[PDB]
Amino acid sequence: NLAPLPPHVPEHLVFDFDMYNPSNLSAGVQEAWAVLQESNVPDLVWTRCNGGHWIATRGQLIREAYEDYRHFSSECPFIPREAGEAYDFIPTSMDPPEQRQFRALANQVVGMPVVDKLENRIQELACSLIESLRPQGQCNFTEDYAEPFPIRIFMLLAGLPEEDIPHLGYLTDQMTRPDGSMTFAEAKEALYDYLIPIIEQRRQKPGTDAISIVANGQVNGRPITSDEAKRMCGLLLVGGLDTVVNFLSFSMEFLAKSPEHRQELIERPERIPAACEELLRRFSLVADGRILTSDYEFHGVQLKKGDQILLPQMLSGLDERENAAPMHVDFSRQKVSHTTFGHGSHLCPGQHLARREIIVTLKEWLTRIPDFSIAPGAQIQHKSGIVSGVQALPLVWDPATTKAV
Ligand code: HEM
Ligand SMILES: CC1(C)[C@@H]2CC[C@@]1(C)C(=O)C2
Ligand SMILES: [K+]
Ligand SMILES: [K+]
Structure with missing residues (x-):
């Protein structure tokens, strides 16, 4: 549905x-x-x-x-x-x-x-x-690896029970790829409602987990509040549950379709970090934005105070004006230009964990299951939003081509 064009x-x-x-x-x-x-x-x-x-x-x-x-x-x-x-x-x-x-x-x-x-x-x-x-x-990669691998590490990092994952993941999905079943507002409130008692507990009995560290934390050398802690912890939850999960699926789908790329990494594993950067460019997946603080002309265009501008992090690296042949995956790309983890003062702080999880996934998968493909006939569907994702990824392989390592 199209909103009337402002004057x-x-x-x-x-x-x-x-x-x-x-x-x-x-x-x-x-x-x-x-x-x-x-x-x-x-x-x-x-x-x-x-x-x-x-x-x-x-x-x-x-x-x-x-x-x-x-x-x-x-x-x-x-x-x-x-x-x-x-x-x-x-x-x-x-x-x-x-x-x-x-x-x-x-x-x-x-x-x-x-x-x-x-x-x-x-x-x-x-x-x-x-x-x-x-x-x-065989596997469904989204639920057999893409979800449980990063989420379990995050839940562990946060000190949160894995029992809660299905709920917390529903809420996060709605904030980035809504069903229609919840407004962002509603899903945010529900995540805050979950965190509240947990934060009170961690403040009473300080622990070593991410939530304890925040909840007991200091800002500017002064005590962070319960409300402040909630607002910070909820966002870490979103980061921890709905970024790497989705990126893993874009990468493996591609690898499942590209025997020559998999071979490259099988033969020269030392290239895996580089391959990681290039996949982060090619399958960049985040797009949020900003709001105009005042009337402002920007590249010959009159932006008005209150206007929203989507500034798709995803797009910088697919821009042919940044990278020649931007839809081609080249593990030896000499300057891999992107803003996949954001740009400016909000630049992602979890990127190191993301890279680690990515490189480890690439290294352990290809070592054990070097040869795999998408299930016959499967028509892979993506979903778009604040954070884009992959609906399902059925992989198949012959067990006789694998290595227990
Ligand atoms: C492939 C994985 C990831 C991608 C592509 C990604 C992308 C981004 C982007 C584009 C931003 C900037 C948003 C903006 O400017 O408005 C951001 C910020 C942020 N991310 Fe990451 N992220 C990833 C993984 C993670 C993980 C694993 C965590 C935490 C466990 C995390 C936590 C955060 C937090 C807390 C911010 C806010 C930083 C700030 O506002 O100062 N992200 N991320
Ligand atoms: C856009 C993001 C990836 C960034 C971290 C989680 C996320 C959904 C945000 O709300 C900020
Ligand atoms: K107009
Ligand atoms: K706001």
């Missing part, structure tokens, strides 16, 4: 892209977003979908906008406006200078010290999961 928005710039159901979805979700970068399309368009908002279609604009928090505020970062307005997660709903004291804390609970401490656990789980599936000669 200030030039009609020639109208491109009715729907970020939650793009027209060319069947071609692939990155492919469907890439329609915004065909030859006839401007750098900055207005869609009347989802309440009406701007979309920057090119990496140069996306980067510039994320650097300029003065004009492009985090305070309303989701589309539609209702979701953006209800979105009060910490730190991402705050701009500098206010954001900063909270980000230091959030950066602590997922940073490299934490990851290295988890390295053994991550290793064991991946190998455990994969070795289980190996003689079976």
Whole structure:
């Protein structure tokens, strides 16, 4: 459904892209977003979908906008406006200078010290999961590996019972790829409602887990509050449950379709980190945005105070003006340009955990199950949203071609 074009928005710039159901979805979700970068399309368009908002279609604009928090505020970062307005997660709903004291804390609970401490656990789980599936000669990758591998590590990191995963994952899905069953507002409130007693408990009896660290944390050297803690913990939950999960599925689908790429990594495993970066570019999956703080002309376009602008992190790296042949996966790409983990002061702090989980997955899978394919006839469907994803991924393989390692 199309919202009436506001008086200030030039009609020639109208491109009715729907970020939650793009027209060319069947071609692939990155492919469907890439329609915004065909030859006839401007750098900055207005869609009347989802309440009406701007979309920057090119990496140069996306980067510039994320650097300029003065004009492009985090305070309303989701589309539609209702979701953006209800979105009060910490730190991402705050701009500098206010954001900063909270980000230091959030950066602590997922940073490299934490990851290295988890390295053994991550290793064991991946190998455990994969070795289980190996003689079976088949799996649904989304539920057999893509979900349980990162989620179990996160739940472990957070100190939360795995029993809760189906609920918490439903809530997170609705915030990024809504069913229609919940508003972002509703799902956010439910996640907050879950966390409240848990935070009170961790404050009374301080522990070593991510939630204890936040809940007992200090900001600017002063006591974080219960409300502040809730707002920060909920966001970590979203990060921990709905990013790597989805990226893993884009990567494995591709690897399942590309024997030559799998061979590359089988023969020269030392390339796996590079392959990781390139997959992060090619199958980049996040797209949120900002809200105009005041009337502002940006690349010859008059933006009005209150306007929302989608600034798709996904698109920077698929921009042919950043990467030649951007839809080709080249593990030896010399300059792998992307903004997959964001750009500007909100740049992802969990990226180290993401890379670790990615590289470990690539390394343990190809070592044990080097030869696999998509189940015959399966027509893989993607889903689009704040964070895009893969609906289902049935893999098959011959057990006789595997290695117990
Ligand atoms: C492939 C995996 C991931 C991708 C592609 C990704 C992407 C992003 C992007 C694009 C942003 C910026 C959002 C904005 O500017 O509005 C962001 C921020 C953030 N991410 Fe990641 N993320 C991933 C994994 C994770 C994980 C595993 C965690 C935590 C366990 C996490 C936690 C966070 C947090 C807390 C922020 C907010 C930082 C701030 O606002 O200062 N992310 N991420
Ligand atoms: C857009 C994000 C990936 C980033 C971390 C989780 C997420 C959904 C947010 O709300 C901020
Ligand atoms: K107009
Ligand atoms: K808000």
